[PDB]
Design a binder for this molecule. Sequence first.
Ligand SMILES: Cc1ncc(C[n+]2csc(CCOP(=O)(O)OP(=O)(O)O)c2C)c(N)n1
Ligand SMILES: Cc1ncc(C[n+]2csc(CCOP(=O)(O)OP(=O)(O)O)c2C)c(N)n1
Ligand SMILES: [Mg+2]
Ligand SMILES: [Mg+2]
Lengths: 552, 552
Amino acid sequence: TATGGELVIRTLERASVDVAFGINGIHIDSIYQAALDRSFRIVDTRNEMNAGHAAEGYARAGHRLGVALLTAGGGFTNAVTSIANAHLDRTPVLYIAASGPLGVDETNTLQAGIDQVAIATPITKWAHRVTRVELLPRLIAQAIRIATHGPRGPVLLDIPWDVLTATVDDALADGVEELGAHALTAALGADAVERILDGLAGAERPVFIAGSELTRGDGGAALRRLAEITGTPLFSDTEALGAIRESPLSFGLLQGLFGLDEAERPDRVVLFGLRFGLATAHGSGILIPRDAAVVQIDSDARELGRLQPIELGAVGDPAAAAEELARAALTWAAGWPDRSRWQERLRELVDGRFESVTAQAVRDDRIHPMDAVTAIAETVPAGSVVVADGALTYLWLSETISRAPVADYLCHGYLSSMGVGVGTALGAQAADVTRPVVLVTGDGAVGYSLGEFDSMVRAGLPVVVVVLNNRAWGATLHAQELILGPDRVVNNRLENGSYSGVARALGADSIDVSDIADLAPTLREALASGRPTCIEVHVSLAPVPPEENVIM
Amino acid sequence: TATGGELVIRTLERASVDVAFGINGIHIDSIYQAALDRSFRIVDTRNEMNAGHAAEGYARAGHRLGVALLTAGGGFTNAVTSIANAHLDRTPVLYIAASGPLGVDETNTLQAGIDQVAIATPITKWAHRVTRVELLPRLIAQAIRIATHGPRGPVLLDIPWDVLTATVDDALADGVEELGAHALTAALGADAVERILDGLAGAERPVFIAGSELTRGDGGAALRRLAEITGTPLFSDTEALGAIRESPLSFGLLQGLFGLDEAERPDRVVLFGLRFGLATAHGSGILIPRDAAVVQIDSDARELGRLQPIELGAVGDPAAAAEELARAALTWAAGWPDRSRWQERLRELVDGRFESVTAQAVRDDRIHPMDAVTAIAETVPAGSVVVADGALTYLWLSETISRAPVADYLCHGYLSSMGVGVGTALGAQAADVTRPVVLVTGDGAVGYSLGEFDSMVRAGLPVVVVVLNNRAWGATLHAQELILGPDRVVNNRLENGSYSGVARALGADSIDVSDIADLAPTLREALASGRPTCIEVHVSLAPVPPEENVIM
Ligand SMILES: Cc1ncc(C[n+]2csc(CCOP(=O)(O)OP(=O)(O)O)c2C)c(N)n1
Ligand SMILES: Cc1ncc(C[n+]2csc(CCOP(=O)(O)OP(=O)(O)O)c2C)c(N)n1
Ligand SMILES: [Mg+2]
Ligand SMILES: [Mg+2]
């Protein structure tokens, strides 16, 4: 005899998940009861929105499946921003949402009468309602297989209250559904491996660029090895920075490719799990030349050649491909040409840009954001997770993050949803409570999730939230003031409030920083203290980050 | 020459809307620019979720259309809880959401690549994308006509960025689309009027019960007149309480009908815009007898007779029906029998229950919630808007609210989404900044929206937020402890944090109350001060509200 909720927890244990995020409710309580009996950890939040974002950050920093538990009705709809974000970011998250009882379908009853499946269908890989309790293990397994294979993404399983409370025979609870233990991701074949390596061997100025899919499959070690065997410079979007950072061949974020002379532009570019899109400057060719030979490895054929021509596309798992390529490159009969001059030209370009951005900063009476994000980048411990939110804030941080020794940099995806950072950081912290998690966020974004300071305190999750306070919704203010004029700024000033005060009232440690020389020492004491912390930094609004310009 | 955004503001002015709620973004800025040129007021919030809830509260307290402005991507998905809530509550809200530019469709670009129409379709009356700028006035008008007619409900208009920035000839901007000025809602015919009045004239123990649709059409005055002409006792769900409260025939919330002897139960019940559902105890018959003659006036035929048999259903606008009935009842040839004994039996039943609930309270060292909600009900000024959130909190308040002289009581609908109250109150306040708005909310619910204290301060919206702090997600804790035992409570204690401290840091006035004798005086000084205020009340967790029992 086992309840539906017991069947959920048992199947999740078999998938090696040991934490889920949610807010309790009567519709979903049989899962909470089962979890208590099996010592399965559920971390509560102050908004289901951040239970979802926590599931994402846990998945992104933990390189694993995240799980969010949502009660019926508003517990589901509050998570929809997180589902959409996981959808565009290709993040493997299983959302388990309870529903109204089928036995009282269409009775205008509590938290019921909304088609949660239909709401989530456009932003999930699969969304499905379980209508009988005996299906639960089989259907959960199917959901887990879909979310954790490429392109990874979110799955919603909607479970009616009276399916969760129904019971099944122990033999039905027993037995194993395929979760992924026996599953092998697609590789590259030997002919493809030989052709890709041969193109790489013929290039004058090649470059590798990694994206989220390589990170999700733990292909960092194999891609770094392949770059090191072949001497190929390694770049990445923000989601794969942690995967390339350790390599002496890492040059950081691919935005640093901007600005080479026309005769020095890369002639060959091999993409591992990176789509054409916002991070590549679309198909404009200013990072990845349109006339380069582009080789694209991705899990979805719709992405191949999407915005610019490719010489070769391969549909398959970028991590598995990096491993096959690394093995064949080690025994490559001709060996690999010396690429040290090309590597050095790239080092100059990327170091030159950092030195210029820092030197060109015009400082006023407040902390310059470049100073603040340099201080933070140069202070975090090796192995830290850095999470970024706000807009001017993350554009500034993007100029220095490539130098930080991060295990993972968790920044905005295409959804670019101001406000996701606090719940993202909280979940990343839960993937390893001993690993530092530093959230760099703006004063606008942080106001979405102030209540989660209480969640961090009660769960023992010692995130350090650094607020860059420019008293404004900053990038949107900039758009009006720079395009249309100072008289055209409207609905963007935020000249009120103390975020450190808010964090203090919620039990977190808190400090204001007005002088740049206090910032790094305060961040160090925050990391040493083992406690959730808010550091409010009073930064200047006027400076325009370089990535804002190249978009202008 | 007019932009799309100008076309939006002009059409909204013609619909007599003068406030909208949103967070600025570059995709939606042409509306913000137009609004600045025309002195159209946009109130900014700290979460689009509360821009939506503010649009709802503005609509519910203002008896008008609410408007929420959402930027592309996450600005849209953060509002989905508000759309769902407006859908189940039948609240007329127009959500205008910007989208990615059509000219860069499918380029993996900023805040784009999500089908916002498809997400909202299951929770709106209409959801549609405007693909050419010249359609905007005509399509906005159509959306406004749908949202403001019965059953009222939310509408989503999705506008691509490059449609909002495109321009149209002034003559196209000029010209009038049908907004509702020339529209007449359906009445009852004379034969229906005569039959309904005749059934009412033959009953021994009749009762009227009003719901949201009567309130939305401003049928309160006509329904009160009809009850007064005929001597019919008037009850209502929480959304129509403000509409019946002024009448000497008002007996308050229909939950007060529980408990009559079998020989005294109502034999005839006329519903005005009230569905069978959570508020009627479904079709259980414990408020509306299954063997009563039920007459149901509602705007949607799916609601007629949904859970219990009806003697007569009429599909039409409950407010317009109340007016036709009132006029015919005034000239009713036979006159109306004396119903004073039945009225008095109802007074005893409703007053008796209040006296019993108050007397049976077992007080410990903390404030009893019944004491707190009685103190608040007996203190608010005549004409106040009271908003309710949290769960134990609103169940307790439901025992005393029928006595308060409220203009409107804005409580949970079927979605029962803990957390909606702060943004709801903020929008209700904006419908008339001189009218008191008191939010009674639990410590759990209030943590969704702490950042909106800053929104109230910057907009000049002096909501008084009263937090009943029992250190817990309270009703869910109760469910575990009362059904399963104290050892089965899990993920529900909230023993951390000072909500008054949070409100103070965000610029609001704030006070803690631990002794019941400080509560009413503190509430009075809060209302007299004209400033946003948080009053944190330390209440006991143990007491079980009566409406929790009748559900148990
Ligand atoms: C959910 C959501 N709402 C609105 C926007 C529009 N937007 C883009 S940048 C920005 C300003 C954010 O300000 P802040 O968090 O303080 O960061 P800053 O630019 O000031 O560093 C806004 C509102 C968005 N991208 N996402
Ligand atoms: C959005 C949402 N999440 C979760 C729930 C489940 N739920 C019902 S009552 C309750 C407790 C709310 O506690 P609080 O706001 O402090 O009010 P109290 O009962 O303590 O007065 C919860 C979490 C819900 N109804 N809606
Ligand atoms: Mg800012
Ligand atoms: Mg509570």
